[PDB]
Amino acid sequence: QWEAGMSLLMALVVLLIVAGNVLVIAAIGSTQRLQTLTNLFITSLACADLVVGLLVVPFGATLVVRGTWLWGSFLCELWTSLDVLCVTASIETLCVIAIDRYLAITSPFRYQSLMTRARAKVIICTVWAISALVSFLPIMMHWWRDEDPQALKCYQDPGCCDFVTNRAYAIASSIISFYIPLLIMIFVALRVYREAKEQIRKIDRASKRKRVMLMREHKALKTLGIIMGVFTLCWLPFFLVNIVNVFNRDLVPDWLFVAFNWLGYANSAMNPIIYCRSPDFRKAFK
Ligand SMILES: CC(C)(C)NC[C@H](O)COc1cccc2c1CC(C#N)=N2
């Protein structure tokens, strides 16, 4: 009866995630003063992580507690699809946030003429569409199924819900859902750092016009940098673990694999906690 304490702790992290993220989606839902562009992208993100803490983590918690899948073959397949989708969405939205920042620094003039709230919403949508095109369909067309015996044994078993995939899909899937979006997000976040240096060097050389709209686009950068940093700190561990497994399945422990996965799962709780930093959000949290 170690199952009772486990159910406890997991219901706690479920609390942190669901409460935090609904708080974010409802705060930006109320204060129009808060409905900035970057805040709307943070909404996309909060909806992904909400889904994680609402389904991905509860159902994934039964499986860890009970050693087996108690919801049958189809719900297994689907639940996996939703985990995958949530991560793909998170990382594509972070990528987009970095790009948005770079533009809203390098071409401030052009930026306010073109980018609006409605264009932000179209963008978030298209992101979720790509996310679901790239993640959701490969699973449902079975492109992920492995030839090996024990694999099929798991497909045949409704209590077997382990993501056992062929190696071409391990590679192409992890590149497309994760490594591409990551790389673009990092290179762009760095080009953004260097712009926000040369700018804060030459703050002297700016009309109280540019020095004030960029004074507003600039603050809330440190937060975004923290968000991105931390995300990388969970999901890169998991995905590297995942790519080594293709070279040699005996090189990674099965519980390390489960650990680094629950690392990235916990990331969906960290984001709300990282918002307690900003006085704009901190006051809105009380
Ligand atoms: C318990 C499970 C395993 C269901 N959780 C999935 C994991 O959190 C995220 O896994 C992935 C996300 C995006 C792209 C991926 C991926 C695994 C592979 C492979 N080959 N390509």
Give a brief description.
With 286 residues, the chain is mainly α.
**CATH fold topology:** Rhopdopsin 7-helix transmembrane proteins
Q: Return the CATH class.
A: Mainly Alpha
CATH architecture: Up-down Bundle
Largest sheet: none
The name of the CATH superfamily reads Rhodopsin 7-helix transmembrane proteins
Order of helices and strands: HHHHHHHHHHH
Helical amount: over 70%
C-alpha end-to-end distance: 38 Å
When the domains are counted, the total is 1
GO molecular function, one term: identical protein binding
Binding site for cyanopindolol: 83, 173, 261
Protein name: Beta-1 adrenergic receptor
Keywords: Cell membrane, Disulfide bond, Endosome, G-protein coupled receptor, Glycoprotein, Lipoprotein, Membrane, Palmitate, Phosphoprotein, Receptor, Transducer, Transmembrane, Transmembrane helix
Which structural traits does this protein have?
monomer; 286 residues; mainly alpha; Rhopdopsin 7-helix transmembrane proteins; 80% helix; globular; binds Cyanopindolol; G-protein coupled receptor; receptor; membrane; palmitate; glycoprotein
